[PDB]
Ligand binder design. Structure first.
Ligand SMILES: *[C@@H]1O[C@H](CO)[C@@H](O)[C@H](O)[C@H]1NC(C)=O
Ligand SMILES: [Zn+2]
Ligand SMILES: [Zn+2]
Ligand SMILES: [Zn+2]
Length: 335
């Protein structure tokens, strides 16, 4: 049936019988999830007007969706305004408990298109799904730059096979893309502003430490901590392979233009890379741009023998420090 819900509670109660679910100007109650899990296959979900959330310090998610063959869209002029500044305290995962925004867990063979998201209190999309596509999704957390936003990852991917992120537009304060695990991930045409870049990892110490076949391309990173990043955990085991960064342009980079390091311990680099996580088939093709004078252009800190078979074409990162601490990287590459 075609259903239109004006409350989160009504949506949760009636969703199953709806072939079309129009969410009209729903203000999600404090500490509650707009629960759109268990949707019937083929359901179309349309966000209308402005979706808001009442304030409460909690872990989220503000919205959770699951089901197979779900088509999520937003009506013209819609906006999902999380007004995250109410939570932002410059501490992100620390300090006030801030809710994760959208759980796309088990939202299989589904698409989310054109959603306009604003000021997520913490991470935006948590992806743990198969054959999921995010097209023309805009995550505007620009306000977080000056209002204390942190750990406002745009797309966190784990335990997902077949993830397509097409033309996302992101202005946040953490990873534009963060893949802790997954296979067949495609991120293309993205605008990544203010965050931590397009990252694989940190990989290791999870139930799934395999990242395979990730293509990040035609993306532009601006005013971010890093542009191209692959991190693996010290002493951890796992596999990172078939990673392609192609046609990546960067500028306003504060820390690293390109960084692939395997020395993350307790969330911090140590300078001592390990080799339990293999990093194979890394292809950088046309990765160019500038970084800050204080940033390191390229940093490749591989464990012994763990990094193999790379392709390095037209990687030209300028304006920063040229690292003299790189090691164990395939000779085709260079810092
Ligand atoms: C890699 O992922 C892409 C995008 O989903 C897909 O077209 C391709 O078949 C995959 N290749 C392998 C070897 O898994
Ligand atoms: Zn506000
Ligand atoms: Zn199917
Ligand atoms: Zn930061």
């Amino acid at each position: 049936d075609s259903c239109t819900f004006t409350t989160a509670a009504a949506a949760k109660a009636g969703k199953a019988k709806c072939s079309t679910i129009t969410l009209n100007n729903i203000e999600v109650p404090a500490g509650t999830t707009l629960d759109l899990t268990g949707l019937t296959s083929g359901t179309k979900v349309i966000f209308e007007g402005t979706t808001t959330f009442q304030y409460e310090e909690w872990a989220g998610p503000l919205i959770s969706m699951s089901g197979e063959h779900i088509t999520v869209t937003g009506a013209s002029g819609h906006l999902i305004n999380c007004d995250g500044a109410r939570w932002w305290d410059g501490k992100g995962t620390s300090g006030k408990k801030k809710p994760k925004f959208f759980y796309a867990h088990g939202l299989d063979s589904s698409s989310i298109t054109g959603l306009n998201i604003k000021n997520t209190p913490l991470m935006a999309f948590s992806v743990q799904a198969n054959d999921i596509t995010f097209t023309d999704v805009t995550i505007n957390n620009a306000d977080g730059d000056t209002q204390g936003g942190h750990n406002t990852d745009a797309f966190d991917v784990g335990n997902s096979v077949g993830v397509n992120i097409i033309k996302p537009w992101v202005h946040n304060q953490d990873d534009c893309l963060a893949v802790n695990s997954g296979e067949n991930i495609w991120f293309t045409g993205g605008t990544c502003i203010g965050g931590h870049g397009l990252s694989i990892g940190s990989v290791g110490d999870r139930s799934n430490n395999v990242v395979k076949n990730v293509t990040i391309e035609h993306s532009t990173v601006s005013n971010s901590e890093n542009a191209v990043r692959i991190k693996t955990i010290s002493g951890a085991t796992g596999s990172v392979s078939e990673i392609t960064y192609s046609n990546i342009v960067m500028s306003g980079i504060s820390d690293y233009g390109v960084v692939i390091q395997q020395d993350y311990e307790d969330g911090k680099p140590t300078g001592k890379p390990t080799n339990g996580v293999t990093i194979q088939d890394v292809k950088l093709e046309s990765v160019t741009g500038s970084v800050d004078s204080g940033a390191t252009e390229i940093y490749l800190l591989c464990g012994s023998g763990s990094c193999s078979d790379w392709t390095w074409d037209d990687v030209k990162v300028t304006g920063g420090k040229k690292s003299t601490a790189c090691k164990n990287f395939p000779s085709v590459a260079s810092c």
